Amino acid sequence: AKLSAVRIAVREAPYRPSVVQFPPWSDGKSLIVDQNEFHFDHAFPATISQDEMYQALILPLVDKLLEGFQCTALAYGQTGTGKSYSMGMTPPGEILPEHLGILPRALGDIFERVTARQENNKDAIQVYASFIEIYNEKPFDLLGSTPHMPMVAARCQRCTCLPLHSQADLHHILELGTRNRRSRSHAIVTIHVKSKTHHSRMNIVDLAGSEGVVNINLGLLSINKVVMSMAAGHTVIPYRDSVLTTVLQASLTAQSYLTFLACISPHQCDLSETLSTLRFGTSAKKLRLEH
C-alpha cells in the first residue's frame, strides 16, 4: 500500500528582475526559471498571502488529520526564502495577524472542528504538541528536560507532548522550544491529535538551508527513496537512511499524506540554489506517482 497523496508546492519569496516567471498563460501550477519549465500541484507567487497559501495547501489536510490519517507539511529550500515564516515557527503573539504561518492556522481549524463535534462523536479528542530538532543527524527533544541529549531506538514516539487548549499554549511551547535551540538545524513541530483509539499526527517540518558552499540534503533525498519504496513494496523501507525519515516513520506509512513546500529566491544571485530546489521538487513529483 502507498500514501494517499504526495503534493508539491512552490512559493516565491519577496523581491528586493525576478528569475521566477509565471507564464501569462498557464494552469497556475507552473513556473519557468532559467528557460526550464517546472510543473507542480501549486505555484505561489510572492504576492500570495499566508491565509491563501494555508487555505489552499494545508486546510484540506485538517480533515484527513481528523479522520485519523497522518499528515506532513515539509518546507525546504535556500536559507532566507521564507520557510520558517511560511510554517509559522515563530511565537504567534509577537507576529501580526496577517503574517501568522501554517502552524497557528492549522491549530485553530483543529480546535474549531473538535469543538464543533465534541457532542456528536465516537469519543473525546485530546490535542498535544511536540517539538523535535535534528542537529547534525541527531534528534533532540526540545520540550523535554534534556533539550541537548540525542535520542536512539526511541525518538519516533517518545517525545514529550505538551497539552494544547489555545493559541496561548502553542505560543508557550514555540517559545520554550526555541530557547532550547542551539551546520544544519531542522525543526519538526508535530500537532498530535490523540483519542482513546486513534493517534494522528500533523508534522510541520521546517528544514534548514538546502544551500551548500551524508551531504546536506540526506533527509530530503531519503524521503524520495522511502516514497518510491512504498509504491513498489520493496519489503524493506529505508526509514533509517536519515534521522528525518526515522523520526517521521509513523507518518510515512500507507494512506498518510505528504506535502512539500519548496521556497525559492527570486534573485539572480541565487539561481543555482533555486534550481536545485526546483529539480528536487520534480523528482518528488515523479516518485509521488503511483500514489
Ligand SMILES: Nc1ncnc2c1ncn2[C@@H]1O[C@H](COP(=O)(O)OP(=O)(O)O)[C@@H](O)[C@H]1O
Ligand atoms: N512571504 C513573506 N512576506 C513577508 N516577509 C517575508 C516573507 N517570507 C519571508 N519573509 C521574511 O524574510 C525573513 C526570512 O524569512 P525566513 O522564513 O526566516 O527564511 P528561512 O526560515 O527560510 O531561513 C524573515 O524576516 C521573514 O519574515
Ligand SMILES: [Mn+2]
Ligand atoms: Mn528558518
